[PDB]
Design an enzyme around this catalytic site. Structure first.
Site, PDB file in Angstrom:
ATOM      1  N   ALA D  18       0.736  -1.241   0.000  1.00  0.00           N
ATOM      2  CA  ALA D  18       0.000   0.000   0.000  1.00  0.00           C
ATOM      3  C   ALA D  18       0.782   1.319   0.000  1.00  0.00           C
ATOM      4  O   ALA D  18       0.214   2.395   0.194  1.00  0.00           O
ATOM      5  CB  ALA D  18      -1.025   0.010   1.162  1.00  0.00           C
ATOM      6  N   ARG D  20       2.632   2.959  -2.196  1.00  0.00           N
ATOM      7  CA  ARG D  20       2.729   3.796  -3.383  1.00  0.00           C
ATOM      8  C   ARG D  20       1.779   3.293  -4.449  1.00  0.00           C
ATOM      9  O   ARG D  20       1.247   2.215  -4.303  1.00  0.00           O
ATOM     10  CB  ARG D  20       4.198   3.786  -3.888  1.00  0.00           C
ATOM     11  CG  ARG D  20       4.667   2.397  -4.271  1.00  0.00           C
ATOM     12  CD  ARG D  20       5.969   2.388  -5.101  1.00  0.00           C
ATOM     13  NE  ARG D  20       6.272   1.064  -5.710  1.00  0.00           N
ATOM     14  CZ  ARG D  20       6.263  -0.135  -5.089  1.00  0.00           C
ATOM     15  NH1 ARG D  20       5.970  -0.268  -3.796  1.00  0.00           N
ATOM     16  NH2 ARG D  20       6.537  -1.245  -5.780  1.00  0.00           N
ATOM     17  N   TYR D 145       4.079 -10.803 -18.393  1.00  0.00           N
ATOM     18  CA  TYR D 145       2.751 -10.275 -18.097  1.00  0.00           C
ATOM     19  C   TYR D 145       1.666 -11.286 -18.296  1.00  0.00           C
ATOM     20  O   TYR D 145       0.790 -11.490 -17.424  1.00  0.00           O
ATOM     21  CB  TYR D 145       2.403  -9.041 -18.956  1.00  0.00           C
ATOM     22  CG  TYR D 145       0.978  -8.538 -18.718  1.00  0.00           C
ATOM     23  CD1 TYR D 145       0.703  -7.680 -17.666  1.00  0.00           C
ATOM     24  CD2 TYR D 145      -0.060  -8.946 -19.527  1.00  0.00           C
ATOM     25  CE1 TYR D 145      -0.581  -7.230 -17.453  1.00  0.00           C
ATOM     26  CE2 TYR D 145      -1.359  -8.531 -19.308  1.00  0.00           C
ATOM     27  CZ  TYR D 145      -1.611  -7.648 -18.297  1.00  0.00           C
ATOM     28  OH  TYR D 145      -2.881  -7.153 -18.036  1.00  0.00           O
ATOM     29  N   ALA D 148       1.754 -14.151 -15.744  1.00  0.00           N
ATOM     30  CA  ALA D 148       1.326 -13.774 -14.412  1.00  0.00           C
ATOM     31  C   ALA D 148      -0.195 -13.647 -14.444  1.00  0.00           C
ATOM     32  O   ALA D 148      -0.865 -14.142 -13.540  1.00  0.00           O
ATOM     33  CB  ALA D 148       2.022 -12.479 -13.988  1.00  0.00           C
ATOM     34  N   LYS D 149      -0.758 -13.123 -15.541  1.00  0.00           N
ATOM     35  CA  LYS D 149      -2.225 -13.032 -15.706  1.00  0.00           C
ATOM     36  C   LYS D 149      -2.919 -14.421 -15.790  1.00  0.00           C
ATOM     37  O   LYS D 149      -4.016 -14.670 -15.216  1.00  0.00           O
ATOM     38  CB  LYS D 149      -2.587 -12.173 -16.931  1.00  0.00           C
ATOM     39  CG  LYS D 149      -4.099 -11.979 -17.106  1.00  0.00           C
ATOM     40  CD  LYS D 149      -4.428 -10.842 -18.079  1.00  0.00           C
ATOM     41  CE  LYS D 149      -5.911 -10.874 -18.460  1.00  0.00           C
ATOM     42  NZ  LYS D 149      -6.494  -9.664 -19.142  1.00  0.00           N
TER      43      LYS D 149
END
Lengths: 242, 246, 251, 238
Positions: D18, D20, D145, D148-149
């Site tokens: 949490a 940034r 990407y 990971a998705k």
């Protein structure tokens, strides 16, 4: 023919029965030398006997795909006595509970990675390879069975696409086959009500044969399939469980 | 009887859009496997080119003029085949219809699926009688570099996948399989005329590092037509060298 | 006469759509009605449609009862004439619809239902795009019911139809995105209606066993998702098909 | 019609990662909706930044140190929360683990998700209500990407099925290219090419991810479970 795998060595995990046996025999039919694996010495010997009975050159070996040591030792053995496996079929997996899908899929993918990384060195040297991952068969009872089937298939698809991207510049393909409800030792004797319910969801109206999975794998292993990579081929008679 | 893996001996195959490229490679593969091949084009000159190509390669069959947009053309073509050659039990659909823009997708996909429905419905009667068939739908290759090209390629691929899955479910009880082959970038006329910088950029998006050949599509089709692929239905097999766009 | 247009200082916190005009097709009952009321809760001027004058009047009566400004109108999304004429009428009397929810459908069925219904989504969506292009803002939301990508339309067609709806929605989103128009779809599962409630106990039980949440969804639960997608907070969501199905995913 | 809960008063939310960007925006959004927000970071300075940010924005809660790769850290932190603040009934997983790397990244990350989710699920089971929301990683790049998705979607759908009878939903948000860290340093030619792949023609804001999470956390999203909501301006990578 153009489907020939003559001169190639193939390693098929989990080859002493069912889909893995059928894969081993199909690759053999196409002319590969086949190394089939089991988790026990008696299984390995049985594989050798099966290959002999079908005129396939190769061997049975003991392999535990959960073990780094087993994998490394087995691959060194193969390299010394038979040659570098350039075709590798990951078929061995390690009521279903509603909370064990994670450890099953997790473990199985860790094993796919372990074996794939071990055999990629030889394919990278050859600048050719086929890695074919076999999904789980439909049938397990309960919502837990459905959960696990879909979770495993989703892990399988993602993993296969990722690895394909990683190794494609080496002319190595990486594909998966997702079986549906196939007649195996594990499904043959399911309760009738469950078998009937499954059949009612299958457009073809029948179980698939192990050989029908193996024919797909044999194609993927061929030169004709050289531009197919990252794919998951469903072999399910039109039943798509998700 | 005869019983050999991969053989299509005794089968009649209809391949639409067979005069060049992918379709020609499909017609010649099916022929190599032992089918009697009817290849079609929208023009007489195309049909003649098909016939000559089949002859040159020792494939039995014919080149015929078919417009899949026309009920009359489809009925007439299937009658001609039925009278002279037999019922087509393998049907491969490859006959799809100033810079390309990202508003053209709907017209093109819609038209192509409506024509696909027409042809498929027509050939299903014969396959239903025979209680056996193969319908194999070929997707469109990437047709342009850039966004419009991607929009239109993904839309066509999505349509094709859904249509294929639906039809497969409809006809599976008759032992008719319905599958699609989704090409990526294939060596064809568009790609043959690209600038080097564009070709190099394109090849960098493909894990295998190369364009596909027409014959690489045809081999997948040939497999799907075989008895060995009897439990594959409703599938879209991507043949794209690892280049996945949706 | 059959009349075809029926009209419907307390500031609810829920209102964020500031009197934007929303067109909800197929708003006489069920999910469409719930969507119309949800958009009203969120402060839109709501035009709900039916294909009959009696439906239009029912919608107007429902909006009135709930304190929502707008109208019930007759629209047939299968008709070019009806879409053009009706949109003109809306533009003249109420304003330009900048939120459009495609919930009217029809139900060779395996082909014709999806084909007809995507042709209708395209027709209405293209009609309303001029106004949204002028405003440089819009929301188009496709309800999976229209092609049968709804559990209640049944398992047989579902996954193939959803694949169509998904691809169509993603393509249209690509086409119109430079104009700050988003295009999304909602795919409902099994939703609680007279039809699913009139199932025999055994059949309802079997159905609920396929749903992890163990219950049918409420129409309002589909409406809340649509309401969110219509909002400013959903400005970066486009080309998405959101399943709202209690964890029952048919393929 | 006009009254209900779409808000989160009386609920406790845990948002991992949490300090940034997306995670901070998530924490603030849940706080705006009325939750008590526990935000976590890997360092004391991060936790202090969280605590200060929450305070500046009038949100009750706390900033805590959590290492989601550690069984010991997860158990100790959850025990601490339960004793001092209450049972978290909304948990947003945005903490990533740093680690041919796609396999270990996805494997480590799903092992973390599973760890944290099992830990928090006891409390949600007692309450007979919960929300678990898993944040994907933002945009070799394509490979990582998409992997990971893919992991994320299957994992989310499976856990949703495991916990759905308890009235707990499990969903994911898959961001596209968001204005954070990385994109703030891209060359103009790359930015321009990137924006051309995005139909909306702009990067997303962190707050645009946070509003989707806020909705998923609400009562109105009670029938959404097992879903991965892409929030990418129309840029889809598979």
């Amino acid at each position: 023919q153009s489907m020939s795998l003559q001169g190639k060595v193939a390693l098929v995990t989990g080859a002493s029965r069912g889909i893995g046996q059928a894969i081993a025999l199909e690759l053999g039919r196409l002319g590969a030398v086949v190394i089939g694996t089991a988790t026990s010495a008696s299984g390995a010997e049985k594989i050798a006997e099966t290959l002999k009975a079908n005129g396939v050159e190769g061997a049975g070996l003991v392999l535990d795909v959960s073990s780094d040591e087993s994998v490394a030792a087995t691959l060194e053995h193969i390299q010394q006595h038979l040659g570098q496996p350039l075709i590798v079929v990951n078929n061995a997996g390690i009521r279903m509970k509603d909370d064990e899908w994670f450890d099953v899929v997790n473990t199985n993918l860790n094993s796919l990675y372990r074996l794939s990384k071990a055999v990629l060195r030889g394919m990278t040297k050859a600048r050719w390879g086929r890695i074919i991952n076999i999904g789980s068969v439909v049938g397990a009872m309960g919502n837990a069975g459905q959960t696990n089937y879909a979770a495993a298939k989703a892990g399988l698809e993602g993993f296969t696409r990722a690895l394909a991207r990683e190794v494609g510049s080496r002319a190595i393909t990486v594909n998966a086959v997702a079986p549906g409800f196939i007649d195996t030792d594990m499904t043959r004797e399911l309760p009738e009500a469950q078998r009937e319910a499954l059949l009612g969801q299958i457009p073809l109206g029948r179980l698939g044969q192990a050989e029908e999975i193996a024919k797909v794998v044999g194609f993927l292993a061929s030169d004709g399939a050289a531009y197919v990579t990252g794919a998951t081929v469903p072999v399910n008679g039109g039943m798509y469980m998700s």
